[PDB]
């Protein structure tokens, strides 16, 4: 289309898509900056997933620790 051009939103995205292109079979334009970015990005995605699940479970767990020691003991306190 004068010319066939493709956009990526950022530069690490350019590096990740060009790395995926090189793995798929695109000719280049072992090694210096790769795959430090791949290792850090994979660990970064692991951080994201683990933080999501741990936030969900602590969000599920802290109502139990505010119910058991405060509300239930206050209930038995006002009871007897």
């Amino acid at each position: 289309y004068r010319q066939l051009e493709l956009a990526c939103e950022t530069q690490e995205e350019v590096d990740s898509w060009k790395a995926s292109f090189l793995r798929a079979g695109v000719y280049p334009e072992h090694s210096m900056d790769p795959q430090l970015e791949r290792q850090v990005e994979t660990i970064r995605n692991l951080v994201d997933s683990y933080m999501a699940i741990v936030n969900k479970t602590v969000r599920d767990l802290m109502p139990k620790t505010i119910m058991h020691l405060m509300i239930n003991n206050t209930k038995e306190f006002i009871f007897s």
Binding site: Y1, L4, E5, L6, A7, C8, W17, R23, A24, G25
Partner: peptide, 29 residues
């Protein structure tokens, strides 16, 4: 292997206009 939204810069009349498509990258296509 890798799918993701990526934008084409120059787009013909038959395709449409400026748009971010969903690219599906495979080891062959």
């Amino acid at each position: 292997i890798r799918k993701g939204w990526l934008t084409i810069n120059n787009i013909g009349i038959m395709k449409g206009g400026s748009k971010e498509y969903w690219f599906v990258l495979t080891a062959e296509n």
